[PDB]
Amino acid sequence: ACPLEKALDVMVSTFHKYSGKEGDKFKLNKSELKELLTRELPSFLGKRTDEAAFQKLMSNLDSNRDNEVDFQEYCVFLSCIAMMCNEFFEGFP
Amino acid sequence: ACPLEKALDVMVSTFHKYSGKEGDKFKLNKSELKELLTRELPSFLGKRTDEAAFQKLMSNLDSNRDNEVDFQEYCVFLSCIAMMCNEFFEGFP
Ligand SMILES: CN1CCN(CCCN2c3ccccc3Sc3ccc(C(F)(F)F)cc32)CC1
Ligand SMILES: CN1CCN(CCCN2c3ccccc3Sc3ccc(C(F)(F)F)cc32)CC1
Ligand SMILES: CN1CCN(CCCN2c3ccccc3Sc3ccc(C(F)(F)F)cc32)CC1
Ligand SMILES: CN1CCN(CCCN2c3ccccc3Sc3ccc(C(F)(F)F)cc32)CC1
Ligand SMILES: [Ca+2]
Ligand SMILES: [Ca+2]
Ligand SMILES: [Ca+2]
Ligand SMILES: [Ca+2]
């Protein structure tokens, strides 16, 4: 009966649902990242799903520049979205 | 529909379910933090937790030392739980 614990469970497991598909099992390459965003975050991705848009995502997220998104970098991304949601509650000051 | 967007929703909404009970409406005080842990993260806390341990947790989450957990501080905490979880999927080395 813990919604917040289930929500941490989904956030972590979803990462691995896609990261294990190709190459490094614990990181998202471009293709695995595209699947995750398109399937799991379509409200974020929204209308725009063109190739130069995923390029910028990869560039924003891949801060250590190994060409993949690891778990820490994915957490930073989810936490950026969480911050944007929080602004709604803070009344958009 | 989208478990990951629903998870983000729960992460962000649970903070505000407790933050707005007392004083600063956007921050958890020591008492609003205890209620959130106790009620929403019971596997993390365990049962019968002493004040030394709680105080440890508070000062750990409270990086700016103002005696409250703000949303940015709460995201660091969750992302640290998440990374502990991620170790299960990874080797644990
Ligand atoms: C089906 N229905 C479509 C729209 N969403 C809400 C979208 C906005 N949203 C949001 C905004 C303020 C506070 C909480 C939330 S939950 C949430 C989670 C992820 C995303 C995202 F997408 F950015 F990652 C957007 C949102 C609710 C579900
Ligand atoms: C097509 N796609 C549709 C959705 N928008 C997202 C609106 C911007 N916003 C945002 C900004 C930067 C990084 C992440 C997010 S997700 C998000 C979630 C909630 C809200 C909130 F709560 F403020 F509404 C706003 C945003 C991006 C473009
Ligand atoms: C009822 N039952 C209690 C036990 N949990 C699993 C506890 C550990 N858990 C975890 C471990 C590895 C991978 C994913 C997860 S989900 C998760 C979420 C939060 C916590 C926490 F608590 F630390 F925040 C612990 C866990 C499943 C449900
Ligand atoms: C009562 N309570 C039971 C839980 N333990 C937490 C120790 C485990 N751990 C952890 C460590 C530091 C910070 C947060 C977390 S939550 C967490 C989630 C999953 C796992 C995973 F995946 F490894 F199991 C281990 C942990 C604290 C005492
Ligand atoms: Ca991979
Ligand atoms: Ca990287
Ligand atoms: Ca408060
Ligand atoms: Ca603080």
Three-state SS across A5-61? HHHHHHHHHHHHHHHCCCCCCCCECHHHHHHHHHHHCHHHHCCCCCHHHHHHHHHHH
The count of residues in chain B is 93
Contact list, B71 vs chain A (CB under 8 Å): 82-83, 86, 90
Q: Give residue A80's domain range.
A: 1-93
**A26–chain B Cβ distance below 8 A for any pair:** yes
Q: Give the three-class secondary structure for B49.
A: coil
- Find out whether B56 and B93 touch, Cβ atoms under 8 Å: no
- Interatomic CA distance for residues B18 and B13, integer angstroms: 9
B49 φψ region: left (φ > 0), alpha (ψ -120 to 50), beta (else): beta
Q: Was B35 annotated as part of a binding site?
A: no
- Interatomic CA distance for residues B58 and B56, integer angstroms: 6
- Find out whether A5 and B10 touch, Cβ atoms under 8 Å: no
- Find out whether A4 and B11 touch, Cβ atoms under 8 Å: yes
Contact list, B17 vs chain A (CB under 8 Å): none
Q: Residue B43 is encoded by which pair of tokens?
A: 């596997």
Give which of B21, B22, B59, B17 is closest to B41, Cα–Cα: B17
Mutation to probe ligand 1, out of A47, A85, A87, A90 (largest number of atoms < 8 A from CB): A85
What sections of chain B are H helices per DSSP? Answer: 3-19, 30-40, 42-45, 51-61, 71-89
Resolution (A): 2.3
Of the candidates A10, A75, A90, the beta carbon closest to that of B3 is on A10
- Interatomic CA distance for residues A72 and A81, integer angstroms: 15
CATH number at residue A65: 1.10.238.10
**B7–chain A Cβ distance below 8 A for any pair:** yes
DSSP code, position A91:
T
Query: What separation in angstroms does the CA of B59 have from each of B16, B25, B29, B55, B65?
Result: 20, 20, 12, 6, 7
Domains contained in chain A, number: 1
- Find out whether A85 and B8 touch, Cβ atoms under 8 Å: yes
Largest Cα separation within chain A, whole Å, is: 44
Q: Was A70 annotated as part of a binding site?
A: no
Contacts 24+ apart (CB under 8 A), B84-90: B85/A8, B85/A9, B85/A12, B86/A12, B86/A15, B86/A71, B89/A12, B89/A13, B89/A16, B89/A26, B90/A26, B90/A71
Nearest CA to ligand 4 atom 22: B85
Q: Residue A80 is encoded by which pair of tokens?
A: 């950026």
Subunit contact B8:A82, Cβ cutoff 8 A: yes
The count of residues in chain A is 93
DSSP secondary structure string for all residues of A50-90: -HHHHHHHHHHH-TT-SSSB-HHHHHHHHHHHHHHHHHHHT
Contact list, B78 vs chain A (CB under 8 Å): 8, 79
**B42–chain A Cβ distance below 8 A for any pair:** yes
- Interatomic CA distance for residues B93 and A56, integer angstroms: 32
- Interatomic CA distance for residues A19 and A35, integer angstroms: 10
